[PDB]
Structures are given as C-alpha cells and as structure tokens.
Amino acid sequence: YLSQPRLTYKTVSGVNGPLVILDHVKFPRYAEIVHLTLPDGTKRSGQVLEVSGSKAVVQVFEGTSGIDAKKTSCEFTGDILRTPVSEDMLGRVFNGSGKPIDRGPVVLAEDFLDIMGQPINPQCRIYPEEMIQTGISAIDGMNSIARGQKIPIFSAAGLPHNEIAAQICRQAGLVKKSKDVVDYSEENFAIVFAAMGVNMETARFFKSDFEENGSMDNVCLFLNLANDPTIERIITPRLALTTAEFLAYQCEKHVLVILTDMSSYAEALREVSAAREEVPGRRGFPGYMYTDLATIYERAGRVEGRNGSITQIPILTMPNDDITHPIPDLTGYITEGQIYVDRQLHNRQIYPPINVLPSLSRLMKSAIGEGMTRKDHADVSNQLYACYAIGKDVQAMKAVVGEEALTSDDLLYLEFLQKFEKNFITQGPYENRTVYETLDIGWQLLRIFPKEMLKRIPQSTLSEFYPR
Amino acid sequence: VCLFLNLANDPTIERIITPRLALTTAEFLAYQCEKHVLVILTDMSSYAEALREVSAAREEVPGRRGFPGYMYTDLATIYERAGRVEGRNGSITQIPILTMPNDDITHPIPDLTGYITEGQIYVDRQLHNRQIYPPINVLPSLSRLMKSAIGEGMTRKDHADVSNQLYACYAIGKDVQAMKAVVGEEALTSDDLLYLEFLQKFEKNFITQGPYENRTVYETLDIGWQLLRIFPKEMLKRIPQSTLSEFYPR
Amino acid sequence: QVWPVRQVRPVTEKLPANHPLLTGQRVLDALFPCVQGGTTAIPGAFGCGKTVISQSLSKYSNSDVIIYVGCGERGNEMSEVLRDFPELTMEVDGKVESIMKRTALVANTSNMPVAAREASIYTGITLSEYFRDMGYHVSMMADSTSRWAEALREISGRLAEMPADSGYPAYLGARLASFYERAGRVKCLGNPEREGSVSIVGAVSP
Amino acid sequence: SLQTSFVTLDEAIKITNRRVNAIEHVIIPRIERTLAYIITELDEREREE
Amino acid sequence: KDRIEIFPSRMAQTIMKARLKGAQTGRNLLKKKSDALTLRFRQILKK
C-alpha cells in the first residue's frame, strides 16, 4: 500500500506545556503519528492534536523537556495509530504503549488494525444465552454473569478490590461440564487484563500472581504504571479492546476483558482535555465523557453467525464513597447491572467483602435456566436473599427488643445470618468453588428451617431437593 | 377583546416583542379613547426563558440561575406601564401570570416580579390535591393598595379589622396544626381545639366558592363575621374594642 | 419525496380530541383514559416494564401504525419485537398476521455519533406525521426521553453555551415544547378530506 | 402485678411514640431542605467560575 | 429554623448527608422499640 518516503522537519515555532507547535508542513492530517529526536539522541513518539493550514501541533507522549528550537528533528508517518494484533500474544506482558517488557521479542504481527475500532451494527447483535463461572461463589450463585453482559464493580479507596480482580482472573471459565467432562474438554476461553493507573506494588503483585496460577497460557496482560506518560493511560484501553475484538471475532473464542481503575482513566482524560484548552464541563470533567465511555464500553456482546463473545467487567473507585459522583453515575447508565463492596463487611475481616443487599443484576433471569444449569437456581437465590434480609433486619430488631423476647424461629434466622456470612460469602483466596458447590452450600444453609418457612420455593422442587 | 396568540410553534424571538406591542395597544386605548382596560399576560416564565435564550447569544454577564443581570430592568420596563394619570379618565390594570419552577419561591423570576409589582396571590396546590375550588393560599398573598382601597365610605367601617383578625387566626391555626402533628391530641389545650375547628370551617367556607358563585362584598363581610363569632370576644386581640362591641353579638 | 426535517407539514386545521385510545388492558383504560391524538408520559426503569406497554399498544389498539424511536438501546428490544411480529399476531381478517407489516422501527446505540442520536427523534416525528397525513391513527413511542436530554446536553457541550441548569442549554424548553406540540387530531390538507391524528408517549426515566 | 405493668407501660408507649413522631415530622424535612439549598449554592459557585 | 445554620460547601454536604443517615437509623430503631412495646401491650391485654 503505502510507498512514499517520509518527511521530517527542523521547524519549531514554539513550545508550550505538553505540546509543540511547528509549521510549513505539507498536507498534514489529523491523528497522524509523529516521531521526534532530541539533541541528546533520545527518541520519543507523539500524536497530532491540531492542524490549521501549514501550521501543526503535536502532543509529545513522553513529556516535553529540553526541546531546542533549531536542533530538533520531527519525522512524520502519514498513518493513524495501528496495532499489530496476533493470536500468539497470549502468554506475554506489555506496557501501555505496547512495547513488550518481559525480555521477549517484538510481536511478529499477524495483522494490522485500527486502534479506534469500528461500531458494531445493532442489527447483528445476539442476546446472551448462557452464564459463566468466575470462581467466586458469592458472585455466581447470587448474581449471574451472562455471555456479553457489562457488569461493573464499584469499590472505594482502601478496599481489596484488586485481590478480588486477581481471584476472578485466575479462576474464570465455563460450566459446560453439566452433561459430561468429555465434551467439556473443548475449551476456547481466554482473558485479557488491562491494569491502568496502578502503583508499583500492585503491578508487581499482579505479575507475580498471574505467573503463579499457572494458567498464563491464555492470559494477555497490559501494564501502565502511574509513572508512565499520562497520555498512555488513555491508549491502553484501546489496544486491549482491539486485541479482544480480534481474538473474539477472528478466532471464534470466548474472551473476558477486565478493566481496572477507570477513575484513573477519567483523570487522564480530564488532563488531556485541559491541556487541549477546551472549555470545562460538569464538575471539571469534559462534557463528552459520556460518549467516550460509551465507545469504550459498547465494544462487546455477541455477533450473529460468529461463535464467540466478549464480556466486560470494568472496575472503578468512588471518591468519598459518593454514589452520585459522575463517574459511577455515567458508568451505571451505560452498563447493565452493578456489584458493590461495602466498607463495613471488609471491616468485619470478611473476604471477599461483597455486599449482596444492594447488588443487582439485569440478565440473571435469562442467563440461567434448565440445561445450562440445574433447575433449582432462581428459587434458591430468591430464598437466600429473603432469608438474609429477614435475618439482618431481625438482628436490628433484637438490638433493642432484647434477645429474651425472641422466638426460636428468630434464633433460626440469626443462625442463618451467621452461617451465611461464615461460609457462603467467606471463601478464601484459593478456594475455587464451582457453581454446583455453591448451590450445594446454598441448599445446606436452607436446610436449617422447614420447607414451610421457605415460602419462595415451589412445592414441586421441595419434594425433590429439601429432604437432602 | 383584542387577542395576541403565540403558540410554541412560533420562533422564540418574537416572544420578546409581543408583550410590549400588546401593552402599547392598551396604553392607546387607555389614554386616547378614555376606556378602562385590563391586561392579562400569561406565562411570563416562558418570556424569561426566551430572554435567557436571546441573551446567551451575545454572552452578557449572568446573574442568579444564569439569567441576565439587566433582566430585572427589562421586566420593570414591561410591568410598570399601568395606572391612572392626571387629567384623563381611562386607566390600565395589569394581571400577569407566571408559573413557579419546582415551587421554589427564591427563583429569580418570581422574586424580581415580587420586587417590581406590589403584591401576589400564590395559588396553592395542597388545596388542589384536596379537590377544592378556587384553591388560593392567603397566608403569603399580599396587596399593597388595600391601605387606601378600603375604609369608611368605600366598603364598611371595620373592613381592615376583619382582615387582620382573620389572617391572625389562620396563622395560629396552621401553627396549631403543625404542633398537633407531633404532640398528640392529649397535649391540646382548649384554644388549640378552637383554632383547629376555625381552620377547618374557614377553609371549607371562606375559600370554597365554586365555578360561578359571585358573592357580593357585604355578603363576604357577613360571612367573615360569621367565622369570627366562633371565638369568644375576649380573644380577638387585633380588632378594636368598639367594633367588637357594636358588631360581634347578634 | 424529500422533505426537510426541522419544520412542520401544513394541514387544513387542528381539531379537538373527542375519542378515547383503545388499550388492551381495562386498567388505565377505564380510570386514566388516554385519548386518540393525545400526549402522555410514562415512567421507565428496569424490572417493572416499559416495552410491555409497547407490546400492549402495538397489538391491542385501534392505531393503524406504530413508530418506535430508540436511543441507547440494545439489540434485545429489536430482536424481541421481531419475535413479537409473528408471536403477537392479530385476527383482523380472521387470520393471524405479523406486526412487521404495520409498524416501523428507528433506533440507535450510544456509541453512534451524537448528532445522529439527536436527529433520531426528529426523523421519528417526521415519519409519524407522514403516515398520519394518509388518513390513519398514528401512535409514536418516543422512549428514552432522558437519553435525548443527555444527547442535548452533549450537543451543548461543544457549543460554548451557558449552562442554564446542570449543563442543559438554554433552549431545552423550546425544543421540548416544539416536540410535544406536533400532535393532536387534524383534518388533512387535500381534496379527499380525510381525518387522522398522532399520539406521543414520552418515557420519562428519572 | 399485671395491672401495674399495664398502667406504667401505657405512658411508656406514649413517650416513645411522641419521640418517634417528633423525629419523623421535624428534623428530617429540615435537613433535606438544607441539602437542597446546599446543592443549589454549589452549582451557582461553579457556574460563575 | 427551616435550615440548619451552616455555610454551604462540599464538606458540609458530607456532614449533612451523614446527619440525615443518622436520623433515619434512629427512626428505624425507634420503630422497632415501638413494635416491641405494642407487642407487650397487646400480650398484657390478651387475657
């Protein structure tokens, strides 16, 4: 395709902040990638921000420092950013820019793609039709995740959400083994993980843990330490999504993308906007944050005629534990469902501190069902939730009514509360529970009472499951 | 009746001009034909919105809730053009109507109207929820011209006194209801019961009129005294002793 | 025919509403009766039902066409109403017949361009007017109205406009009025002298 | 014994009910209005800038 | 009277939201005590 020699300029009409203005450029185009070479020999990349006649502006990625007026080369590429996607990238580790960092070789690209991606036709959407298992009993049993659902995970500063993310990574998978393990051996599942805006301790911890779990043969990893250039923050997600797309729809696999710390994404985007001199929007965040998060989240689902899917589990932190902060508000609007973690539960030394009372789901009704699972799921979930809500409000009642006036059934509700928080929720970092184990523990916890109190379960399944 | 109609279909900028045009017509009929005229501008809130829209084009300095600073002077240019002038016979009365966004009374439009004009009515929605007609609050209503509108030879000797005492009883009745909402019926003293029955009776009698019932003024004063007679004479503090002596017992 | 979007077709005259809209369910049909050629609004949130009303009106109503407008929706609603086409079928001529032959859909997703999201509701209004002009009884479900509100905020985000309230541009009220105005019964302009109407159902999503 | 407990428990219920009623019909609306005013003021201050 | 006297600010928003939450929890806890008291009243008057 491209065959022309590239240009290079020694023109610098000025510099200001993280930008560098030049001119006398022939037929510039927007979003063109630009290299730079300083007097001391360092090489730095960049992108074109502004274009006006023969004037140009380039935001230098690595940060502007020591750029002379007359001694500075500026080569142009003439193409927008393009990713070298390839199936073989699994088992590797990269930085934000895509340069490998695990002592490995440059990726022998199998195909080149546009970093931005393209919108997917709503006509060719396919509704989800089956669940998955994340390895967490609290999440699978109480709140199903379909193929193609977009469930965020709200957390706050000071909670162990990162440990939960690592646990989800090292145990995510499928439950097709309902019928037979022989037909289950056909596994076509992979995970792509995008650590962004992460401090150094957590980056090392992630790398070590992922390497320890022994399933790195199906994990792609992207790291962007908080040291690296702030603009690389808002380029890491695009690379991750392009890779996930190429794997999903060109290899017919089942990919699970997990994004971390979207608050840092928001902050980096804010800084880019403010450097770009644009007028501020609400709360100092730019107006089109909605559109931007939309174009990031909307790349998933299922495609008619392709055997594959993309599931999204973004994570983010709520400043000041404020549920009406814009980032969680917009994230909730665009996405489907929500999962909480609560300070008090972590403060009860319960791991994972997953607060199911305000945790919802949107596709649970259709993710589960006969065949893809047992026939005894939805009623069990309803009963567990109802029992737990009764138990908690009843503890609130006994707090003042006195334990002496309590009925014996009241003690049964308290027993349910304590056992539910002792066994169902608490699992431990490596106790890989399956869905079937989770439902077994659920039935065991339900066995405390007679079927008469269990008024959310149909009698037909009571005659089968309750007397076990 | 001369009519001026600007539905939502029409471009918003014409809404700036229409009021002044109608008001000019009114002034002509008031001072060049010696007729008596009544003006009814409706939904000046939409006018304020259109003023905000046109101002935002020029990037003028804002005020509270983003309205122009000079919006006050502009509303003054509209409203004031009213009254009666020496050496003539006509007169201009004006009855603008405006809606209150989110019932927030501190909102700039109703506030600046309250500054310019000399009164208010404050249609209530609580009464509308009780299905009462015409549902008009009186506690925050105001009429600055009453001090010379009424008196001997105009309506009746004690017209002001009836007004003062009725309002006072209404206010203490609302206070007693707010008190009853917490303490309970046992804590009520006798005068609380008197104030509450006064509140109920006054609401179902004075306020409620009907779609076309048109009471004479003297009928209204007779009814007001009928409501005042409920209390014993030794508690109507505001009314003078004379009026109570000559009117209360009947 | 090609017709500009931001203007209203002429008619002979607007007429009063004097007929009640037919709804399949006696509840909200005998208590809070909607009117043919009326204007209404319905809350909309997950778990209670919003497109349930769409199904009920699309099958059991005297309307001659449904025009649905979507903003920020999934392929679910499209595929499910596609399933309603051979499922929710009516014995109008004693024969079950698909809703696909009657209704039309215009929808977009969030990740499509902003201006498209805004132009969606106007093209929907135009189509509703065009089918009304043919002597019919249109019903237009302009759902996800709060999404259109966010779309207008987005448009204003790149115009250096003064934020009237929470970023909402000043002319939000003007656009609201101009939208809901285009509705009601009309005797149509033309020799045949037919009569029809348009209804609107704006799904508020607080 | 029963009658003594009844007579005292009556005034106990009365004081408890008075406390809950006073709490639910005085302070909560006041705080809610204060929060509405605060949100409005914060919006004003940001828009000026 | 109708507004707790404080300077508006963001920190103030946090403290007032917390005070509202405290009032709500107090109301619920009082409701539970009232439930127990009326239960005792009814059971005393039972027979």
The DSSP string of A24-43 is: --SS--TT-EEEEE-TT--E
Are chains A and E touching, using the cut-off of 8 Å on CB pairs and a minimum of 3 such pairs? Answer: yes
Closest CA to B83 of B36, B149, B120: B36
Give the Cβ contact number of residue A375 at 10 Å: 14
Contact D47 B62 (CB under 8 A): yes
Paired tokens of C147: 């999404």
Instruction: Name the phi and psi angles at B83, rounded to 5.
Output: 130, -165
Rounded CA separation B90/C22 (Å) = 55
Amino acid at D30: R
Q: Which helix (H) or strand (E) holds A168?
A: helix A161-171
The neighbours of chain D, by the rule of 3 or more Cβ pairs under 8 Å, are B, C, E
Which residues have a Cβ under 8 Å from the Cβ of B71 and sit 6 or more positions away? Answer: B48, B51, B52, B55, B63, B108, B112
DSSP state of E7: -
E-only strand ranges, chain B: 36-39, 91-94, 119-120, 142-143
- Classify burial at B70, counting beta carbons within 10 Å of its beta carbon; exposed 0-12, middle 13-18, buried 19 or more: middle
DSSP state of A180: -
State chain B's maximal CA–CA distance in angstroms. Answer: 68
Q: Which helix (H) or strand (E) holds A406?
A: none
Which of D15, D38, D42 has the most E C-beta neighbours within 10 Å, making it the best mutation to test the interface with E? D38
Find out whether A224 and A195 touch, Cβ atoms under 8 Å. yes
- Classify burial at C191, counting beta carbons within 10 Å of its beta carbon; exposed 0-12, middle 13-18, buried 19 or more: exposed
Closest CA to B104 of B47, B52, B65: B65
Is E14 part of the contact surface with chain A (CB cutoff 8 Å)?
A: yes
Rounded CA separation D43/A349 (Å) = 40
Is position B229 annotated in a ligand binding site?
Answer: no
Distance of CA B63 to the CA centre of its chain: 27
Which residues have a Cβ under 8 Å from the Cβ of C123 and sit 6 or more positions away? Answer: C5, C106
Which residues are bridge partners to C139 per DSSP?
C66, C199
Find out whether E44 and D37 touch, Cβ atoms under 8 Å. no
Using an 8 Å CB-CB cutoff, list residues of chain C that contact chain B.
8, 161-165, 170-171, 173-174, 177-178, 181
D20 closest CB neighbour out of E8, E9, E27 = E27
Rounded CA separation D25/D30 (Å) = 9
Contact E9 D42 (CB under 8 A): yes
Find out whether A435 and A133 touch, Cβ atoms under 8 Å. yes
Find out whether B199 and B177 touch, Cβ atoms under 8 Å. yes
Rounded CA separation A175/A364 (Å) = 16
Contact E32 A402 (CB under 8 A): no
Closest CA to C50 of C74, C32, C30: C74
Instruction: Name the phi and psi angles at A278, rounded to 5.
Output: -70, 155
Q: Which of residues 359-398 of A touch C (CB under 8 A)?
A: 362
Rounded CA separation B88/B34 (Å) = 7
Question: 3-class SS at A371?
Answer: coil
DSSP state of A416: H
Q: Which of residues 142-181 of B touch D (CB under 8 A)?
A: 181
Rounded CA separation A430/C120 (Å) = 50
Long-range CB contact pairs, B8-13, < 8 A, 24+:
B8/C174, B8/C177, B8/C178, B8/C181, B9/C8, B9/C178, B9/C181, B12/B49, B12/B50, B12/B53, B12/B54, B12/C171, B12/C174, B13/B50, B13/B54
Are chains D and B touching, using the cut-off of 8 Å on CB pairs and a minimum of 3 such pairs? Answer: yes
Is D26 part of the contact surface with chain B (CB cutoff 8 Å)?
A: yes
Q: Which of residues 1-60 of C touch D (CB under 8 A)?
A: none
Q: What is the dihedral of CA A436, A440, A445, A448, to 10 degrees?
A: 150
Binding-site sequence positions of C for ATP: 44-51
Paired tokens of A6: 């590239």
Q: Which residue in this structure is represented by tokens 């967490």?
A: A136
Rounded CA separation C126/C139 (Å) = 13
Question: Residue A356 half-sphere exposure, CB side, CA atoms within 13 Å?
Answer: 25
Amino acid at A2: L
- Classify burial at A342, counting beta carbons within 10 Å of its beta carbon; exposed 0-12, middle 13-18, buried 19 or more: buried
Q: Which of residues 48-67 of B touch C (CB under 8 A)?
A: 49-50, 52-53, 56, 59, 62, 65-66
E14 closest CB neighbour out of A320, A396, A397 = A320
Chain E residue at shortest CA distance from A394: E32
Closest CA to A423 of A139, A159, A137, A172: A137
Closest CA to B181 of D24, D28, D34: D24
Contact C157 A286 (CB under 8 A): yes
Rounded CA separation A149/A72 (Å) = 49
Rounded CA separation C36/A128 (Å) = 38
Chain B residue at shortest CA distance from D14: B184
**Three-state secondary structure of chain C:** CCCCCCCCCCCCEEECCCCECCCCCCCCCCCCCCECCCEEEEECCCCCCCHHHHHHHHHCCCCCEEEEECCCCCHHHHHHHHHHHHHCCCCCCCCCCCHHHCCEEECCCCCCCHHHHHHHHHHHHHHHHHHHHCCCEEEEEECCHHHHHHHHHHHHHCCCCCCCECCECCCHHHHHHHHHHCCCEEECCCCCCCEEEEEEEEEECC
DSSP string, A340-352: -B-HHHHHTT-SS
Question: 3-class SS at A426?
Answer: coil
Instruction: Name the phi and psi angles at C173, rounded to 5.
Output: -65, -40
Q: Which helix (H) or strand (E) holds A59?
A: strand A55-60
Chain D residue at shortest CA distance from E18: D31
Long-range CB contact pairs, A373-379, < 8 A, 24+:
A373/A131, A373/A175, A373/A178, A373/A435, A374/A436, A374/A439, A375/A461, A376/A439, A376/A443, A376/A461, A376/A465, A377/A141, A377/A439, A379/A456, A379/A457, A379/A458, A379/A461
Rounded CA separation B189/A244 (Å) = 76
Crossing angle of helices C75-87/C51-59, nearest 10°? 30
Instruction: Name the phi and psi angles at A32, rounded to 5.
Output: -95, 135
Which of A401, A403, A410 has the most E C-beta neighbours within 10 Å, making it the best mutation to test the interface with E? A401
Find out whether E41 and D9 touch, Cβ atoms under 8 Å. yes
Using an 8 Å CB-CB cutoff, list residues of chain D that contact chain C.
43, 47
Give the Cβ contact number of residue B63 at 10 Å: 14
B181 closest CB neighbour out of D17, D25, D48 = D25
CA A10 to each of CA A24, A28, A70, A305: distance values in angstroms, whole numbers, following the listed order: 10, 16, 6, 52
**Cα angle at C65 between C61 and C66, to 5 degrees?**
85
Contact E45 D6 (CB under 8 A): yes
DSSP state of B151: S
What is the dihedral sign for C-alpha A237, A243, A244, A246? positive
Find out whether C99 and C174 touch, Cβ atoms under 8 Å. no
Question: 3-class SS at E40?
Answer: helix
Which residues have a Cβ under 8 Å from the Cβ of A459 and sit 6 or more positions away? Answer: A451
For chain A, domain boundaries: 1-468
The CATH code belonging to domain A1-468 is 3.40.50.12240
Query: Which alpha helices (H) appear in A299-338, and where do they start and end?
Result: 326-334
Find out whether E23 and D19 touch, Cβ atoms under 8 Å. no
Find out whether A377 and A443 touch, Cβ atoms under 8 Å. no
Residues of C in contact with A286 (CB under 8 A): 157
Which residues are bridge partners to A222 per DSSP?
A94, A194
Is D45 part of the contact surface with chain B (CB cutoff 8 Å)?
A: no
DSSP state of A71: S
Closest chain C C-alpha to D47 CA, distance in angstroms? 8
Q: Which helix (H) or strand (E) holds A259?
A: strand A254-259
Exposed e or buried b for every residue in E17-47, given b needs 16+ CB within 10 A? Answer: eeebeebeeeeeebebbbebbeebbeeeeee
**Cα angle at B195 between B191 and B197, to 5 degrees?**
115
Rounded CA separation B250/B248 (Å) = 6
CA A446 to each of CA A142, A226, B83, C53: distance values in angstroms, whole numbers, following the listed order: 14, 47, 81, 38
Residues of A in contact with C73 (CB under 8 A): 122
Which residues have a Cβ under 8 Å from the Cβ of B200 and sit 6 or more positions away? Answer: none
Residues of C in contact with A295 (CB under 8 A): 111
What resolution in angstrom units was achieved for this structure?
4.4
What is the dihedral sign for C-alpha A395, A400, A403, A404? negative
What is the dihedral sign for C-alpha C46, C50, C52, C55? negative
The method recorded for this entry reads cryo-EM
CA A120 to each of CA A229, A239, B42: distance values in angstroms, whole numbers, following the listed order: 31, 17, 50
Contact A281 C76 (CB under 8 A): no
Is B13 part of the contact surface with chain C (CB cutoff 8 Å)?
A: no
Paired tokens of A461: 């399944």
Q: Which residue in this structure is represented by tokens 């208590």?
A: C31
Q: Which helix (H) or strand (E) holds D49?
A: none
Contact A401 E29 (CB under 8 A): no
- Classify burial at A236, counting beta carbons within 10 Å of its beta carbon; exposed 0-12, middle 13-18, buried 19 or more: buried
Find out whether E37 and D16 touch, Cβ atoms under 8 Å. yes
Using an 8 Å CB-CB cutoff, list residues of chain C that contact chain A.
46, 72-76, 78-79, 107-112, 114, 150, 153-154, 156-158, 160, 166-167
Residues of D in contact with C166 (CB under 8 A): 43
Please count the residues of chain A: 468
Find out whether A302 and A255 touch, Cβ atoms under 8 Å. no
